Design a protein around this nucleic acid. Structure first.
Ligand code: MG
Ligand code: ZN
Ligand code: ZN
Length: 1339
DNA sequence: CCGGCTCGTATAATCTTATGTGAGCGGATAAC
DNA sequence: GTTATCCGCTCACAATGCCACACGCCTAACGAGCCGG
RNA sequence: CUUUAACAUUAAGCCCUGAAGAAGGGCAAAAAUAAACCAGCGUGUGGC
């Protein structure tokens, strides 16, 4: 029907089924097919469902339209349309009751969770193997106690009429309604208030939440068991018309026939007083038959004749890649469409495409019919059909009137990102292929290798106007993933423009003088002066530094004839120094980009067209071919290979004498072949790039070459140094598929021949790369599918949330070069707070403005290192994202409008380039200030600097204050310098030992042995070839039971032998000793201030991004600190080693367990702040969230995923990854109960908690306390309020079972739901629809 | 002169190169 | 002893899109049919 | 015994609307439900 709100779901009562149906099927036969009338009371019928033909009795009595409503008596068939055959249900009244298969085997077992009874027991009740007891009463036995035949017989001896024990589905049906619901809830609530054990509280909170949701619905525990089973309207499972004889049956019809045969046989056996064994067996057969009908997968049994495939049950018509969500309710086939192969056609403009004439007559047939019947050239529709099937000459003029302003959508099939479908205007072509403008071809990522494209037609008025405004190809220049133009001129235009704008030192007409650029053109056409000969010309140029107008300026510049020709298509704005250089690929790309920045939109489009036209024209007049004498072999290749063979023979002889081992032999050979390959490549590149010597009109000079493939590489059209390296120099080192890299490299190039073995070796890398591509495609597609499932319901919905939180951005520095500066990251995001000038108390930026480009430069000039800026993850708006929390939009210019469905474009921007992926001393480098962060150090006796703080960090600074470089300075290392010591570059400023942990002291004196007994705790090991016998101290577990209860310790004393206190505190720090602690300076030996007491020895591709957005737990994570306090070890081997951290003021209830196998960092007297590392390794983000706050997990995810995308040169803006992070941490647990109705262990979406706390804080009550969860993206999709949006995604079965038990109700808000139903989307245009509806509802 | 043959048709049965997850449940396992 | 945990076994559920093309989708024995021997 | 005998027909309701004994209904009770005539899905291959 129409005008309906939210969809409601619940269980279905038997009386509801009798309210549905229109008759009772009794006979299992479909049709007689002697005559093809349907059999009465079969699966097909006419009295039950409806008329076979239109408006006719099956008897054939009433055949007139004016007899509607009155049924026949010859056939009992209501004279109605055959659409009624699509819509009337049927019912079957079963003999025995029957268990539903989903509620038994969803696995959370709904019956088993409800009755508190294990699943296997209920299974061997339902399949007739046991008994249950139903109100035994004055009986030894209990209720849920189950038996066998022997205990049942012995009970019949004992309590022969007391207990009531049944079996089969009737017994479970008896147990279900015998149970109350209120008493179980109140009893188990009192029991949960009388329980402290955790797992019992888990199970009981599950059971009472099940019961409370089950009572707050409408339904009952009787309804999980079927009694009356409904059947589908028989047009919806149609009988296949074959050719000759019989009709081919579907799967549903065979399953219903089997069920009805079994039901009739059981009903007759009940009619004749059958013995008990046979009716038990028959009820088991009927239960198994209904379990085969509803879902064939739990018992994979029903297979048909001549095709041993599982038949398609009703649940198989919903799941999978062919059920009604993925197949038919999202991707529908569409009329007015078409398909062809494509073809270039370089004469087009940017906003049009080539359309075949005949196919365009075929598409627009109704518009043609309307134009013909308008102009009087026809009267009926059949006259118009005859005229357009004759293809008379008036029809082509009519078709050209139909085209003129009516755009057409074009599409390429594996659509990744939102530039995949675009709208053009048509230009008619007598042909059979679709022409397509060549600049757009990079955006589609189209070949011309046979790639096919498709055509759709917008046909209403709003669709034409949207395809003109929102989607015409003159409106998509910048990319939504990053603000870069997608209209880069490709390979051939690059070659043309690079060949035009060069120079050579002696040509025709060199050094003459010219008037305009057009006289240089007239000299090029006549053949008087060549295309590139240097010449002084006169140029006028316009500069718009005047505030909104143009300033002329005329001068004489030393330039080239080709550059003067190219200047004629540059518009008024740009300065002449944009076309004075050699103009490769990136140069003309930034030419287009600066033309977009300074002038606007329309000169950018028309300038890209003029560039494409003249680039193809002069690429034609070049004649740049390629030939076998354009690949210059070096003259020095032969002796380099000879010297490499001499060196490998010498290393082979040094291995043969036995001096060098095999691994170092391997390493020397691979190093010298790497060096030889690099030398040959250097020689060939130096021989190609500059060999061209030409006569000056003096003697000789040098210049950049005019060789063919060097122009094809130096312009950046096709190829790199690597491909042109393999063509003439030798090719690399081929690696075998085991993972090793082979000894002998391929000594030959491609211009010479390869022999048999070397080609056979190269085949390995070929097939490896091909298989990698073949699997990488599918994995990227699946990950894109899941991300756009997650982020779909999120729309920029209001203007200004108006908060004062956010994040702090600093330009990222690994320690090598600064990877991303502050300009590129925080271009175009709205400032959180007023970042002050380095001139203090001077407002450099207002707190609530937008960092546009000029403003970004004026922020850059004062060398700001950290800017605070508003993110999406802290935006305040319920059910959406505020506008100023998201900033300016990519692919357009200004701030984002209210409605842009940013979650979908974000998921596409992450998931689009997924195909391109794959599947001992600190040394400063420049001069600046030396800053050490979290440093607490002391100079020892030997002048070295040992640090008593773990978290020391190195910052190389300039004179300004911005960070030049950064490194990590370990705890207590060998430091060549101190803090703030102004040093210069190239300096190794630090060192340490990777096999010695610092057990450094704090005072001077002696070190004495407390509980360090040789034979109990410590051992005396003599280094047998040096002479310094030392002591080795283990931990408690590695030594035996003689020192297991003992704790060895190096007690820090003075030279007298007494504990000198730490300067600042009053605590003696005796040093208890961990394992592998080699104590060198023993008792009686004087120590220093912080001296080494004990020496202690110790992915990346696409699945990294997959395992990160799943947020799955890494192996052996890093233990953090829960709250600050003094560390204290405790009891050993109660599973693990205990640890108690005592706060300064609060108590210490948490006594954390640590596997003593894994190592540790902190010491006993040491105390650390919360969230700090204990055992090194990977980290799960759960801990990062619950300890370091909310922004920390966003920064961790952004930096890691952005490292994986910076490794391949892929540039993706950060706000997309932020708005994917927001949809991951939306659920929440509750810590208290609060003052409202929320339970404690209640998982609940955060925004409802936030509006509940806002409503309670409006009054004077107390709120609730919540811990923000963090789920995987598939777990976040699969737990959503809309039960449609979780049904369309994977595991539809479990979602429909849980949603049908709970009886939910889906508001239809979001994108995916309204696509399913088929009204306007609440995202784009139609957003302005929905709130216009919403104010209609509330008022 | 009913079904022996011959046909219309309704309906029952002895794999064996996969991976990675999560999620749950039965059996051991370390304490007052 | 008995109780609250830890761990190994078993099992459901996912794995891009589109295109063309092409050939496939029962029968030994239980209720009727013909009429010969 | 004086010139052919025979007048029959007892059974189906009550109430409302309606110009009526013109007609339209409900309730106490029940056997029995030709024609003149507008006009698919499951395997394989290949491509991107
Ligand atoms: Mg291609
Ligand atoms: Zn009829
Ligand atoms: Zn906000």
């Amino acid at each position: 029907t129409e005008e309906f709100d939210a969809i409601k779901i619940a269980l279905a009562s038997p009386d509801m089924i009798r309210s549905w149906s229109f008759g009772e099927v009794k006979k299992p036969e479909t049709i007689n097919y002697r005559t093809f009338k349907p059999e009465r009371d079969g699966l097909f019928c006419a009295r039950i469902f409806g008329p076979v033909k239109d408006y006719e009795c099956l008897c054939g009595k009433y055949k007139r339209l004016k007899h509607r409503g009155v049924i026949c008596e010859k056939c009992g068939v209501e004279v109605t349309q055959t659409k009624v055959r699509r819509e009337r249900m049927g019912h079957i009244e079963l003999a025995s009751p029957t268990a539903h298969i989903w509620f038994l085997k969803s696995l959370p077992s709904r019956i088993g969770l409800l009755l508190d009874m294990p699943l296997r027991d209920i299974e061997r009740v339902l399949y007739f193997e046991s008994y249950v007891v139903i109100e035994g009463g004055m009986t030894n036995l209990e209720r849920q106690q189950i038996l066998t035949e022997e205990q049942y017989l012995d009970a019949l001896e004992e309590f022969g009429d007391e207990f009531d024990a049944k079996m089969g589905a009737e017994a479970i049906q008896a147990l279900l309604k015998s149970m109350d619901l209120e008493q179980e809830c109140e009893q188990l609530r009192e029991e949960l208030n009388e329980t402290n054990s955790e797992t019992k509280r888990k199970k009981l909170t599950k059971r009472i939440k099940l019961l409370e949701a089950f009572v707050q619905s409408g339904n009952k525990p009787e309804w999980m068991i079927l009694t009356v089973l409904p059947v589908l309207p028989p047009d919806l499972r149609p009988l296949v018309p074959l050719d000759g004889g019989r009709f081919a049956t579907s799967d549903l019809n065979d399953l219903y026939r089997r069920v009805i045969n079994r039901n009739n046989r059981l009903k007759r056996l009940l009619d004749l007083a059958a013995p008990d064994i046979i009716v038990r067996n028959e009820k088991r057969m009927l239960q198994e038959a209904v379990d085969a009908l509803l879902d064939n997968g739990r018992r994979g049994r029903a297979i048909t004749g001549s095709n041993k495939r599982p038949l398609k049950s009703l649940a198989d018509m919903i799941k999978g890649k062919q059920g009604r969500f993925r197949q038919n309710l999202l991707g529908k086939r569409v009329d007015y469409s078409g398909r062809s192969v494509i073809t270039v056609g370089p004469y087009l403009r940017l906003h049009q495409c080539g359309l075949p004439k005949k196919m365009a007559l075929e598409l627009f047939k109704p518009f043609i019919y309307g134009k013909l019947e308008l102009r009087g050239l026809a009267t009926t529709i059949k006259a118009a059909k005859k005229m357009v099937e004759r293809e008379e000459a008036v029809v082509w003029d009519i078709l050209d009137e139909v085209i003129r302003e009516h755009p057409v959508l074009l599409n390429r099939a594996p659509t990744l990102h939102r530039l995949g479908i675009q709208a053009f205007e048509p230009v008619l072509i007598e042909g059979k292929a679709i022409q397509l403008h060549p600049l757009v071809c990079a955006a589609y990522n189209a070949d011309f290798d046979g790639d096919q494209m498709a055509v759709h037609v917008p046909l209403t008025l709003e669709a034409q106007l949207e395809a003109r405004a929102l989607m015409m190809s003159t409106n998509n220049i910048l990319s939504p993933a990053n603000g870069e133009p997608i209209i880069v001129p490709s390979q051939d235009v690059v070659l043309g423009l690079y060949y035009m704008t060069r120079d050579c030192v002696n040509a025709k007409g060199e050094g003459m003088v010219l008037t305009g650029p057009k006289e240089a053109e007239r000299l090029y056409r006549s053949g008087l002066a060549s295309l590139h000969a240097r010449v002084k010309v006169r140029i006028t140029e316009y500069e718009k530094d005047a505030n909104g107008e143009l300033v002329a300026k005329t001068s004489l510049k030393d330039t080239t004839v080709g550059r003067a020709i190219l200047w004629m298509i540059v518009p008024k704005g740009l300065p002449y120094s944009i076309v004075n250089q050699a103009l490769g690929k990136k140069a003309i790309s930034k030419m287009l980009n600066t033309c977009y920045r300074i002038l606007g939109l329309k000169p950018t489009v028309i300038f890209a067209d003029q560039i494409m036209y003249t680039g193809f024209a002069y690429a034609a007049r070049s004649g740049a071919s390629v030939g076998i004498d354009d690949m210059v072999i070096p003259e020095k290749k032969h002796e380099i290979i000879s010297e490499a063979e001499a060196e490998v023979a010498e290393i082979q002889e040094q291995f043969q004498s036995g001096l060098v081992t095999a691994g170092e032999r391997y390493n020397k050979v691979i190093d010298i072949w790497a060096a030889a390959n690099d030398r040959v490549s250097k020689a060939m590149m130096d021989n190609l790039q500059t060999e061209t010597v030409i006569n000056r009109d003096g003697q000789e000079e040098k210049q950049v070459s005019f060789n063919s493939i060097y122009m094809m590489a130096d312009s950046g059209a096709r190829g790199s140094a690597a491909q042109i390296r393999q063509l003439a120099g030798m090719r690399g080192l081929m690696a075998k598929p085991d993972g090793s890299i082979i000894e002998t490299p391929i000594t030959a190039n491609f211009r010479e021949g390869l022999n048999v073995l070397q080609y056979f070796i190269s085949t390995h890398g070929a097939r490896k790369g091909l298989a990698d591509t073949a699997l990488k495609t599918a994995n990227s597609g699946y990950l894109t599918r899941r991300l756009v499932d997650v982020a779909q319901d999120l729309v920029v919905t209001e203007d200004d949330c108006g908060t004062h939180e956010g994040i702090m951005m600093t330009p990222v520095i690994e320690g090598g070069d600064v990877k991303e500066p502050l300009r590129d990251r925080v271009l175009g995001r709205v400032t959180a707070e007023d970042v002050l000038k380095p001139g203090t108390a001077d407002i450099l930026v207002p707190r609530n403005t937008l960092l546009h480009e000029q403003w970004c430069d004026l922020l850059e000039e004062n060398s700001v290192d950290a800017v605070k800026v508003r993110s999406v993850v802290s935006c305040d708006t319920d059910f959406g994202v505020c506008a100023h929390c998201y900033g300016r939009d990519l692919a357009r210019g200004h701030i984002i409008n209210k409605g842009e469905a940013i979650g979908v474009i974000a998921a596409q921007s992450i998931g689009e380039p997924g195909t391109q992926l794959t599947m001992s001393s600190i040394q400063v480098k420049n001069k600046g200030s030396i800053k050490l962060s979290n440093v607490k150090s002391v100079v020892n006796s030997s002048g070295k600097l040992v640090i008593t703080s773990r978290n020391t960090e190195l910052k190389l600074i300039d004179e300004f204050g911005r960070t030049k470089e950064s490194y990590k300075v370990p705890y207590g290392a060998v430091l060549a310098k101190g803090d703030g010591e102004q040093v210069a570059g190239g300096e190794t400023v630090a060192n340490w030992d990777p096999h010695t942990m610092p057990v450094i002291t704090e005072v001077s004196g002696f070190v004495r042995f407390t509980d360090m007994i040789d034979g109990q705790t410590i051992t005396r090991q003599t280094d047998e070839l040096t002479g310094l016998s030392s002591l080795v101290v283990l931990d408690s577990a590695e030594r035996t039971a003689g020192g297991k209860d003992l704790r060895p310790a190096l007690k820090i004393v003075d030279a007298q032998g007494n504990d000198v206190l730490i300067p600042g505190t009053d605590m003696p720090a005796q040093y208890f000793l961990p394992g592998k602690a080699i104590v060198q300076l023993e008792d009686g030996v004087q120590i220093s201030s912080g001296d080494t007491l004990a020496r202690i020895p110790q992915t990346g591709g696409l699945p990294r991004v997959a395992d990160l957005f799943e947020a799955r737990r890494p192996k052996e994570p890093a233990i953090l600190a829960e709250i600050s306090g003094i560390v204290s070890f405790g009891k050993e081997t109660k599973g693990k080693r205990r640890l108690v951290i005592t706060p300064v003021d609060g108590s210490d209830p948490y006594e954390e367990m640590i596997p003593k196998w894994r190592q540790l960092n902190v010491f006993e007297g040491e105390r650390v702040e919360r969230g700090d590392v204990i055992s090194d390794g990977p980290e799960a983000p759960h801990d990062i969230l619950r300890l370091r706050g909310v922004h920390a997990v966003t920064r961790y995810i952004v930096n890691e995923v952005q490292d994986v995308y910076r490794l391949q040169g892929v540039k993706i803006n950060d706000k997309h990854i932020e708005v994917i992070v927001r949809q991951m941490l939306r659920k929440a647990t509750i810590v208290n109960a609060g003052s409202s109705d929320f339970l404690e262990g209640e998982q609940v979406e955060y925004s409802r908690v936030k509006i509940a706390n806002r409503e309670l804080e409006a009054n004077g009550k107390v709120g609730a306390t919540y811990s923000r969860d963090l789920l995987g993206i598939t777990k976040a999709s699969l737990a959503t309020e809309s039960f449609i949006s979780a049904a369309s995604f994977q595991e539809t079965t479990r979602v429909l079972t849980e949603a049908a038990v709970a009886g939910k109700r889906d508001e239809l808000r979001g994108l995916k739901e309204n696509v399913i139903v088929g009204r306007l989307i609440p995202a784009g245009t139609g957003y302005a629809y929905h709130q216009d509806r919403m104010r209609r509802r509330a008022a």
